Amino acid sequence: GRRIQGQRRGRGTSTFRAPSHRYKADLEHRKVEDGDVIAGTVVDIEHDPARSAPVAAVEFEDGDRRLILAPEGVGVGDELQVGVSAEIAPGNTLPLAEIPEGVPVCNVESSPGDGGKFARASGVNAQLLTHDRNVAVVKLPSGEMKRLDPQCRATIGVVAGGGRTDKPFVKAGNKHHKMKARGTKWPNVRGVAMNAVDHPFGGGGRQHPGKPKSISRNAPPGRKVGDIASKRTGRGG
Amino acid sequence: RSGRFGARYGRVSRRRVAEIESEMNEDHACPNCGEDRVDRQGTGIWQCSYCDYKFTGGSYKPETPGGKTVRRS
Amino acid sequence: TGAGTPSQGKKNTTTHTKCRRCGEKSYHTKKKVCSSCGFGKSAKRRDYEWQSKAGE
RNA sequence: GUGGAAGUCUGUUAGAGUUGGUGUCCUACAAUACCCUCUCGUGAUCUAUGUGUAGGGGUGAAAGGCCCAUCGAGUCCGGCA
RNA sequence: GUCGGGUGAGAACCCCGACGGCCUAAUGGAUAAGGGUUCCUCAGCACUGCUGAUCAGCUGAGGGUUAGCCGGUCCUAAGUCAUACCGCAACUCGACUAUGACGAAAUGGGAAACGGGUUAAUAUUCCCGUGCCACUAUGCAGUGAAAGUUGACGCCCUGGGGUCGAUCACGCUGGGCAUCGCCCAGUCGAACCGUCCAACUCCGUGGAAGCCGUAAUGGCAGGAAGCGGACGAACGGCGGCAUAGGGAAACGUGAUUCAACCUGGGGCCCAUGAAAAGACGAGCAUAGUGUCCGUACCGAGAACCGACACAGGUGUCCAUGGCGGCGAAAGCCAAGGCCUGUCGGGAGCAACCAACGUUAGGGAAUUCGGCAAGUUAGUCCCGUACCUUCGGAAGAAGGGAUGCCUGCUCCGGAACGGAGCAGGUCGCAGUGACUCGGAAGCUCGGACUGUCUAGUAACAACAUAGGUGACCGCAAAUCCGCAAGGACUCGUACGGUCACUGAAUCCUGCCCAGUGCAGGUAUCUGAACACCUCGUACAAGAGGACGAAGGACCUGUCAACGGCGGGGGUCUUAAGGUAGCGUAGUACCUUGCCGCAUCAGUAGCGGCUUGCAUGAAUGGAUUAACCAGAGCUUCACUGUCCCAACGUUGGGCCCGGUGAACUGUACAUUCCAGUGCGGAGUCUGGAGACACCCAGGGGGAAGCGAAGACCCUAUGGAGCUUUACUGCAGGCUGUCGCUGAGGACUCUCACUCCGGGAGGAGGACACCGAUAGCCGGGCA
RNA sequence: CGAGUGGCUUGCUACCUCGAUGUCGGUUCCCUCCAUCCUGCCCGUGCAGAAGCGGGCAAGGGUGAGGUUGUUCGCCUAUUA
RNA sequence: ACGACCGUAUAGUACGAGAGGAACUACGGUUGGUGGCCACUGGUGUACCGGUUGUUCGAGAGAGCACGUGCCGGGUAGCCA
Ligand SMILES: [Cl-]
Ligand SMILES: [Cl-]
Ligand SMILES: [Cl-]
Ligand SMILES: [K+]
Ligand SMILES: [Mg+2]
Ligand SMILES: [Mg+2]
Ligand SMILES: [Mg+2]
Ligand SMILES: [Mg+2]
Ligand SMILES: [Mg+2]
Ligand SMILES: [Mg+2]
Ligand SMILES: [Mg+2]
Ligand SMILES: [Mg+2]
Ligand SMILES: [Mg+2]
Ligand SMILES: [Mg+2]
Ligand SMILES: [Mg+2]
Ligand SMILES: [Mg+2]
Ligand SMILES: [Mg+2]
Ligand SMILES: [Mg+2]
Ligand SMILES: [Mg+2]
Ligand SMILES: [Mg+2]
Ligand SMILES: [Mg+2]
Ligand SMILES: [Mg+2]
Ligand SMILES: [Mg+2]
Ligand SMILES: [Mg+2]
Ligand SMILES: [Mg+2]
Ligand SMILES: [Mg+2]
Ligand SMILES: [Mg+2]
Ligand SMILES: [Mg+2]
Ligand SMILES: [Mg+2]
Ligand SMILES: [Mg+2]
Ligand SMILES: [Mg+2]
Ligand SMILES: [Mg+2]
Ligand SMILES: [Mg+2]
Ligand SMILES: [Mg+2]
Ligand SMILES: [Mg+2]
Ligand SMILES: [Mg+2]
Ligand SMILES: [Mg+2]
Ligand SMILES: [Mg+2]
Ligand SMILES: [Mg+2]
Ligand SMILES: [Mg+2]
Ligand SMILES: [Mg+2]
Ligand SMILES: [Mg+2]
Ligand SMILES: [Mg+2]
Ligand SMILES: [Mg+2]
Ligand SMILES: [Mg+2]
Ligand SMILES: [Mg+2]
Ligand SMILES: [Mg+2]
Ligand SMILES: [Mg+2]
Ligand SMILES: [Mg+2]
Ligand SMILES: [Mg+2]
Ligand SMILES: [Mg+2]
Ligand SMILES: [Mg+2]
Ligand code: NA
Ligand code: NA
Ligand code: NA
Ligand code: NA
Ligand code: NA
Ligand code: NA
Ligand code: NA
Ligand code: NA
Ligand code: NA
Ligand code: NA
Ligand code: NA
Ligand code: NA
Ligand code: NA
Ligand code: NA
Ligand code: NA
Ligand code: NA
Ligand code: NA
Ligand code: NA
Ligand code: NA
Ligand code: NA
Ligand code: NA
């Protein structure tokens, strides 16, 4: 049997790779020696082809010009600050410890220094619940209670572009255009429509999977399709 | 609105596109001063044609329900 | 559109050219590697034991 | 009234496609051609050039389709008498 | 093509002329790739040329391609390679990271050339004239100089500026025509230098509480109109260039519409639309230098790819030549090209065929089927059903008009633009050719555009938006690799992965028994090391204890595979078909029964329906819109048929020239019987038969073509499958080493990760090497 | 119940062809058989007539058109000697 | 190389209670088949004549092209049914 489509992806051929050369920049926080002195101005508001969300262009004191992840409510001319003693204003990036409890935050660091990792997409946000000298418990958009090093920086506010998901694509044409600007193969042929040779759900006199859809975690790649290690399925119950 | 879709697509698709584009094409109050000239420049990009105040907000809305909550806290 | 006669018409791309090293028209100008002598890939002349019979 | 949206319509504009004729041809003009007929025709559009993916591997809006007239595993030589 | 004539031993097809034609986004003009001398000249015809040849893309010999300002070079793109690093038994192999290099000749970016003249063949290259760019040198100025600007960028709508072209008015020059006074061509003049400035941005002035303004949007007391100013464009205008150039001559002037080019405004994205070198920023005189590579030609129904001088295929630019018209459409005509989509002569030219024309009366009787053909047609006015997701259905349907001539009207600045009026008048017919829909209805399918079997399937198959489930906090899920490493990822749950269902609408019942996945699990099962006894002076080996994942066992879960009966008024095996839908593209019985419809209807539709053997995301039903999708009906229409005829064009037939292939055990003028391995020209018996030839439509040679695809056989093959046999990756798990300090725990020093660092986080775990048990069609 | 004839059907058999004898239905065009549907001449009748019913000789000629179905078959219509 | 039918008279007769209802024979016609012919009706008739749309030869006159006639009207001979 030939390799299934999921295996082709792993090679990282052109068809599957993301259009990097077309992308703008990796949105990371600013590395400050210390002091918190670092502050800049919002020059413009652009659209990041990589996240479909907006982005803010900023110019600091020391000459630095770097595009940053634009939360909601930031405009041209405004002022942002990066550091330990930064003001608690929307957009200002600072460690979790300095941030008061119950405030919506985005672009949270998974480890201090990495430059952000959590809460980055359209209109999402984390939630700072607890404080300690050792821990800092954050509520990630998925609802999980992430325990974090209070030294990890995070931006105040919710990510802009909220409400994108709300309106349907309406037509194949529009989806096509979204996907072209991503490293995803599109469209998608259901494995049950393929031949016996091309995918486990293939073949048969009609369209149906011969094997039960759920499948073990331990299964080798090439067979790992369908409902993976499902803790259950359906909605009923 | 969705009058350009013809009879194709259905009620739910051309109705969810008519209202979401009906509130996207409305007079929006700008956060800088108070003039209702904010129009949609792009995906999430908002700008007021009066003072040129270009800013960030929801995709189709200049302000989202969760973006008004950041102010409180 | 047949792969035959009709698809012979587009064939006007250049590929294998006169290899500087061995002197054959086997220098793939898109790969810059010879199919015959191997010039461009190996410093050693491409040679295989199957270009002739086993006991020879 | 203005405005001029649209995987919108008409359409041998250009270009792309290939429904029926089971026509013509069927030691052809042609190892897939000719004619009339028909479909799309601002978009998931068509196209040139460059460039990437290689054989149990690619590539596949999936027909086991395509990868130089070669594919339910290309071609060359060898194993091989 | 025909008549002349030329050259020649030879002339249907080589050349001149006249007459006649074909090509119009191409059969014209310029080219990319590719070809490679095919280009020009001379001399030739043994070869090549679908006939011939005095011709040639052929044979032979000679000649031909000239650049600072056209290309290449240079720059960077997707990306490619080299060296270093690491991997590998290893390499000419392999991912990352550094560095360097490569990567665009029509068609990315880019310092600079125009007019004319000349050759058999080159030509912004040579010659004549004029101008321009760069570098160096010199001289003067300049002390500025790098910040900024440019290079430099999507799709749709649209305003203004405006050259060429075309057309109109008028004048001049030349030509054409000859009832009239019209008709055609021409009326030229570059780069460059200088000069002007519209739109946009901005300043002053001003001072609108309703004004200003647009095609449209819009503007404003945060200051509108108006007035003045700064900045500021065309390949545009104007002068120079130029008693240059070019023209037989005149060597114009105004206008409209305006491709090129210039410059604004508006809209759209779950799509955001290159980079670098370079240029500007930053003067001038004079002189010096500007090397190397291409440069002919074809660019296609004979120079390219397809074995061919192949009816095939092959990118760009010229889309503004006239009438016509909505038009880059038809059609007819220029300019230019051609008569080489290259064999000819003769016959009222038969039969037969191929394209096609017309056919009385009838009008789908033809037929699986209206297949094929036909019918309708453009524009305007009147008018328009059911149904509908309110978009549509719709150009529904149905009804009327349409020319030419005369004189006008209205809109606009106007058009050689449009809309209308009155009168007049010819035909069978006024969209007079051309161009140019047949309409209506019921049902099935998939919602829609879209996709697909290059080369018998274009659909109902795929896709799709929409829906649903699943996995995962990122040192993740999923996938590639032996490894070093890598895609996803310049990504972060409004995500990306994995699957199913397939628009909207109304809904989507019951079953966890089995199978699958997931969770738990007292006890039970469960490998190896270490630990114990036994044994062996050691070892083999016997036994004991402990026991991981896994399983037993329990729970969860069907929008997870899948199921939804028999019997009686419960049994198998968990439940026992709910809404719908129903003789279905599912119904064996079947042409089910009733009805509509027809003279007649295995068809179609509606109802009924016990459904052999329908049914809810294996999605059910319903449904507007769309469809080279499947079946049916009506009006219209017609040579489809009744039932054929006559015609046109190309063949066909006879003559000249050229000149293959298939196929061939032999004999062969057979026919009717018989007989034979049961399907005989060839045996047997009869009959018939003088030989040769032309034409025909194909009865026979079980005609020719292909060592039958159908069937079975072979201890044949391959692809695919699984709870077939045996394996293997891979995942999970114990144990060994890496590996250190004081059945549960602390710590840091190895090792890991983050961090630029200081340090931060994890920590003897993880990673990796070995072993052991479980799973294990992903693979063999 | 008994005796038979034909070779349309069906079945059985495996002789013939697997280096191929092109399928069913239809169409078209040609010769034939008789076990006669019509037409000609007869017989019997439960033969008044007319109209039929059964049988005999007889293959000259005829034996058509349409609706559903791919159908053969067959079902249906209207004509018909 | 002719097959068959309908009709008229025979006849409202024979026969029969009645209803109904023959034949021999003589005529005329239709249909299928067959052979031939073109005065007649019809088809064709890109021989011919006329009308007219577009365009080109300046107009006019007269002509070319519009697929082997632009389209339309008429149509001789002949060949035909
Ligand atoms: Cl998506
Ligand atoms: Cl060049
Ligand atoms: Cl404007
Ligand atoms: K056989
Ligand atoms: Mg990143
Ligand atoms: Mg979704
Ligand atoms: Mg992609
Ligand atoms: Mg799909
Ligand atoms: Mg399939
Ligand atoms: Mg499989
Ligand atoms: Mg299915
Ligand atoms: Mg299914
Ligand atoms: Mg369209
Ligand atoms: Mg045929
Ligand atoms: Mg390509
Ligand atoms: Mg298949
Ligand atoms: Mg080959
Ligand atoms: Mg092929
Ligand atoms: Mg030579
Ligand atoms: Mg020549
Ligand atoms: Mg010569
Ligand atoms: Mg280079
Ligand atoms: Mg260029
Ligand atoms: Mg030349
Ligand atoms: Mg040239
Ligand atoms: Mg030729
Ligand atoms: Mg007729
Ligand atoms: Mg019929
Ligand atoms: Mg048809
Ligand atoms: Mg006026
Ligand atoms: Mg017409
Ligand atoms: Mg469809
Ligand atoms: Mg095909
Ligand atoms: Mg199709
Ligand atoms: Mg087809
Ligand atoms: Mg589908
Ligand atoms: Mg979806
Ligand atoms: Mg989805
Ligand atoms: Mg029915
Ligand atoms: Mg259900
Ligand atoms: Mg004999
Ligand atoms: Mg065989
Ligand atoms: Mg078989
Ligand atoms: Mg096998
Ligand atoms: Mg690291
Ligand atoms: Mg196997
Ligand atoms: Mg046998
Ligand atoms: Mg035969
Ligand atoms: Mg008899
Ligand atoms: Mg009687
Ligand atoms: Mg007979
Ligand atoms: Mg003519
Ligand atoms: Na299957
Ligand atoms: Na309106
Ligand atoms: Na076609
Ligand atoms: Na292979
Ligand atoms: Na071999
Ligand atoms: Na100027
Ligand atoms: Na015109
Ligand atoms: Na010739
Ligand atoms: Na379409
Ligand atoms: Na379609
Ligand atoms: Na179960
Ligand atoms: Na279960
Ligand atoms: Na079921
Ligand atoms: Na006809
Ligand atoms: Na024969
Ligand atoms: Na196979
Ligand atoms: Na038999
Ligand atoms: Na044989
Ligand atoms: Na047949
Ligand atoms: Na007879
Ligand atoms: Na019948």
- In degrees and rounded to multiples of 5, residue A208 shows phi and psi of -165, 150
In DSSP terms, A80 is beta-bridged to A40
| Tokens representing residue C12 in the block | 């006007």
Interruptions in chain B after residues (C–N over 2.5 Å): none
Instruction: Please report, for chain A, the start and end positions of each structural domain, with discontinuous segments joined by +.
Output: 1-78, 82-159, 160-237
Chain B residue closest in CA terms to A155: B70
Instruction: Please report, for chain C, the start and end positions of each structural domain, with discontinuous segments joined by +.
Output: 1-56
Structure determined by: X-ray
Which run of H or E residues covers position A173?
Answer: helix A172-180
Rounded Cα distance between A158 and A125, Å, is 5
Determine the number of helices (DSSP H) and then strands (DSSP E) in chain C. 0, 2
B50 touching chain A per CB within 8 A: no
CB proximity B14–strand E (7 Å threshold): yes
Rounded Cα distance between A47 and B56, Å, is 10
Cβ(A72)–Cβ(B58) below 8 Å = yes
| Cα-to-centroid distance, A227 and ligand 58 (Å) | 74
Task: Locate the DSSP E strands across A61-211.
Answer: 65-68, 79-81, 93-95, 104-106, 126-127, 136-139, 145-148, 153-156
Rounded Cα distance between B3 and C32, Å, is 57
* Whether CATH 3.30.300.10 fits A160-237: no
Determine the number of helices (DSSP H) and then strands (DSSP E) in chain B. 2, 3
Q: Which CATH class is domain A1-78?
A: mainly beta
Q: How far apart are the first and last CA of chain C?
A: 47
Q: Which residues contact A71 (CB under 8 A, 6 or more apart)?
A: A90, A91, A106, A107, A155, A156, A157, A158, A159, A160, B56, B70
* Whether CATH 2.20.25.30 fits C1-56: yes
Q: Could you give the number of structural domains in chain B?
A: 1
Task: Return the number of other C-beta atoms located less than 10 Å from residue A155's C-beta.
Answer: 29
- In degrees and rounded to multiples of 5, residue A147 shows phi and psi of -85, 125
Rounded Cα distance between C31 and C39, Å, is 11
Task: Return the number of other C-beta atoms located less than 10 Å from residue C34's C-beta.
Answer: 26
Rounded Cα distance between A231 and A105, Å, is 31
Instruction: Considering the domain delimited by A82-159, tell me its CATH architecture.
Output: Roll (2.30)
Q: For residue B12, which residues of chain A lie inside 8 Å, CB to CB?
A: 168
CB proximity C13–strand E (7 Å threshold): yes
CATH code where residue B46 lies:
2.20.25.30
List Cα–Cα distances, A11 to A14, A89, A131, A195, in angstroms.
Answer: 9, 45, 44, 22
| Cα-to-centroid distance, A2 and ligand 68 (Å) | 14
Is B33 annotated to bind a ligand? Reply is yes
Whether A167 and B31 lie within 8 Å, measured CB to CB = no
